[PDB]
RNA sequence: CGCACGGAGGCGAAGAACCACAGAUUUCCGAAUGAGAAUCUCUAACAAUUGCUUCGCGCAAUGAGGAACCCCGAGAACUGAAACAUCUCAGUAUCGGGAGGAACAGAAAACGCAACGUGAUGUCGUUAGUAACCGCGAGUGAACGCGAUACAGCCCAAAC
RNA sequence: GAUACAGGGUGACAACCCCGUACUGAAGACCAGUACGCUGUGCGGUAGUGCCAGAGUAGCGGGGGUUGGAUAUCCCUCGCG
RNA sequence: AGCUUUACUGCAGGCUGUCGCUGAG
């Protein structure tokens, strides 16, 4: 079986969702942790100085 | 327009929710005749109706009741 | 505050609920419950209220399907309206 | 004459002779069954709290707190790395125990502030040493003239920013002349140097 | 599937904000909407 | 009668619009705190950690945010050395913790132009690419002092 | 005209068409709960007195990190003191 | 760059002595 085209028919699964906290479709319902703010993983906001240039 | 602030704080704390429940009752015949698709409105008074029902709750605030 | 009671939801198939059945179709608040929605609509009409529907639309709105008792005509009560 | 005080201050110069060492004997037993940061109603060794600023006051709280002896817990490196940054048995953390140890304490108690802290001896593995910590909003301290100074806004979280005894011995400002040249007026100032 | 309360509620919206630009901001502007989503060209949140 | 010049209609001399200050209202999720949940739901709530305590959540504290700045910790590699290991890149990037409107420092167990001298601390200019380090290779690199800015000096522990 | 010839707008190039601009004045914010002034306290000096004055510290050794710090940087850790 | 080994240099880990914990005859 291809890992291309005929392996993405069975992609039905819903993980990341609009997170309640921040908006952002990233909410893994599976995890139940937002890839985007962090929310379920840190009552802190999830940033990382590499978001942006060393500089800036 | 039609009712002033004046007008509201010369009412009495009994006066204002008589006065309260009659607006909100015109301001609901006018949502459901909008709702019917009915023209006889009148745009001003559905805004205004509004506005009226903010000032005397504004006002039985302010007054304490 | 919220109210219950948004406005008659007036349309074909309401119609006949009012003539055929005697019942009443209203936009109400989705925080009511159909108790809530029941006495609501007493109090506002002055009228009997047997039983109430509800529907949770895909205009986020709730609908209310309240039917009255024989005693009342729904006609009439929106016919005031 | 002496004071009373001078008699307690003695015995723990020498922690491992007379009664004293008998005591320690004693009560490490307790101490090793007890957790990370107990809350004792008063200080194993008065001369020294007093000395830094304790108070058998309302707001004043005392709190022993126990850390494991030696160097860094360490994992190995995981990706390339030049045969000078390999290491991980030798490699010692920059912050002494005794500063650990306030920072376990100051964290139990997040609405308080530490004053300072004293050793109070160790075992073959671990590390005691009492914390004095102070409630910066109780009136018996906001109207303390030796005190109050701890309840300013700049004075949150002091412990964590090394503004304490230990914090300041262990940033290398004791010294107010040569040796001192990349520590004061911070080790950051001085591009961590120090 | 199964739709939330919630979940329903943004559908809604998302349906709702797929109207067009009213006819009188036309003219009133004297001369798009923007977010005009299919539901089969185009993919939702969630 | 917003952007926004439509239609209908309305508001304003009972002084509206508009601007300033102050106040009212301020759904749900959110540190999110009664419990659970993809912004909803279930049956009275400072959840959790603490201080005081009338030992009752009664009175209080913490939590999270913010452009960067600041303080305390953890800490690479590409690269340079025309290879490379110490060295260098660099205590840099990045990570953990935390404060403020600025931080930090600070009234000498100092300096050591050695003196019959200076007199808390930052910072700026200079001292100086000097002293010092270094496969003594490549590279690295201060301080005292001086000229300035601004100036301010005090409180405990103990004795009694 | 000008203590106003900065700038902008206005159907083409504007000191004098309009807003502004000079001059004068007003308010808020910051400086700052600072300076000054004041209330209270009481500074200081002689003689006598070994009454007091911060310990795992000062310091030494083993192992590391760090620094220009070289025998002579700062710090950590284990032991001694 | 991946891999190998009695290539160079190091780093974990294991074994072993010693110091601390650690005391009485
Ligand atoms: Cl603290
Ligand atoms: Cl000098
Ligand atoms: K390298
Ligand atoms: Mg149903
Ligand atoms: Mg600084
Ligand atoms: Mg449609
Ligand atoms: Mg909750
Ligand atoms: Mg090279
Ligand atoms: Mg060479
Ligand atoms: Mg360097
Ligand atoms: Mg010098
Ligand atoms: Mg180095
Ligand atoms: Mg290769
Ligand atoms: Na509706
Ligand atoms: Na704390
Ligand atoms: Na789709
Ligand atoms: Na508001
Ligand atoms: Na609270
Ligand atoms: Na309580
Ligand atoms: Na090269
Ligand atoms: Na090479
Ligand atoms: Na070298
Ligand atoms: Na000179
Ligand atoms: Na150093
Ligand atoms: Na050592
Ligand atoms: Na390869
Ligand atoms: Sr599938
Ligand atoms: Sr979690
Ligand atoms: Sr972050
Ligand atoms: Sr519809
Ligand atoms: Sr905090
Ligand atoms: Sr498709
Ligand atoms: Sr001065
Ligand atoms: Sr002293």
Redesign the interface.
Same mark, same amino acid.
């Given at each position: 079986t291809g890992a291309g085209t005929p392996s993405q028919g069975k992609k039905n699964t819903?993980t990341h969702?609009?997170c309640r906290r921040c908006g952002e479709?990233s909410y893994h319902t599976k995890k139940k942790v937002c890839s985007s703010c962090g929310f379920g993983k840190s009552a802190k906001r999830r940033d990382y100085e590499w978001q942006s240039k060393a500089g800036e | 327009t039609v009712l002033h602030v004046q007008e509201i704080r010369d009412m009495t704390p009994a006066e204002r929710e008589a006065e309260l429940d009659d607006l909100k009752t015109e301001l609901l015949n006018a949502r459901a005749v909008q709702a019917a698709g009915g023209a006889p409105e009148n745009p001003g008074r559905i805004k205004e109706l509004r506005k009226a029902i903010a000032r005397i709750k504004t006002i039985q605030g302010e007054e304490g009741d | 505050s919220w109210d219950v009671i948004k406005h008659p939801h007036v349309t074909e198939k309401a119609m006949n609920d009012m003539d055929f059945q005697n019942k009443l179709q209203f936009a109400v608040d @989705?925080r009511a419950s159909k108790g809530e929605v029941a006495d609501a609509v007493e109090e506002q009409y002055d009228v009997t209220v047997e039983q109430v529907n509800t529907q949770?639309?895909? @205009?986020?709105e709730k609908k209310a399907v309240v039917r009255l008792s024989e005693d009342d005509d729904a006609q009439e009560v929106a016919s005031r309206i | 004459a002496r004071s009373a005080y001078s008699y307690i201050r003695d015995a723990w110069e020498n922690p491992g002779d007379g009664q004293l060492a008998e005591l320690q004997w004693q009560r490490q037993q307790e101490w090793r069954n007890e957790g990370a940061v107990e809350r004792i109603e008063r200080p194993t060794r008065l001369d020294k709290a007093r000395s830094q600023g304790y108070k058998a006051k309302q707001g004043v709280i005392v709190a022993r707190v126990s850390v494991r002896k030696g160097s860094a817990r360490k994992r190995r490196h995981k990706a390339g790395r030049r045969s000078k940054r390999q290491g991980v048995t030798r490699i010692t953390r920059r912050k002494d125990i005794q500063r650990v140890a306030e920072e376990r304490a100051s964290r139990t108690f997040p609405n308080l502030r530490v004053l300072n802290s004293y050793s109070v001896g160790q075992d073959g593995r671990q590390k005691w040493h009492e914390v004095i910590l102070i409630d910066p909003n109780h009136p018996a301290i906001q109207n303390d003239d030796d005190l109050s100074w701890i309840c300013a806004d700049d004075q949150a979280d002091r412990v964590f920013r090394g503004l304490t005894g230990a914090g300041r011995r262990n940033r290398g400002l004791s010294g107010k002349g040569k040796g001192s040249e990349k520590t004061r007026p911070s080790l950051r100032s001085n591009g961590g140097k120090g | 599937?199964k739709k939330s &309360?919630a979940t &329903? &509620?943004?559908?809604? &919206?998302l349906?709702?904000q797929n109207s067009r630009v009213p006819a009188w901001v036309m003219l009133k502007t004297d001369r798009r909407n923007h977010k005009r989503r299919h539901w089969r060209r185009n993919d939702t949140?969630?």
């Open positions: 819903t969702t609009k479709k | - | @989705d949770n639309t895909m @205009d986020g | - | 599937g &309360k &329903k &509620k943004r559908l809604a &919206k349906d709702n949140d969630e």
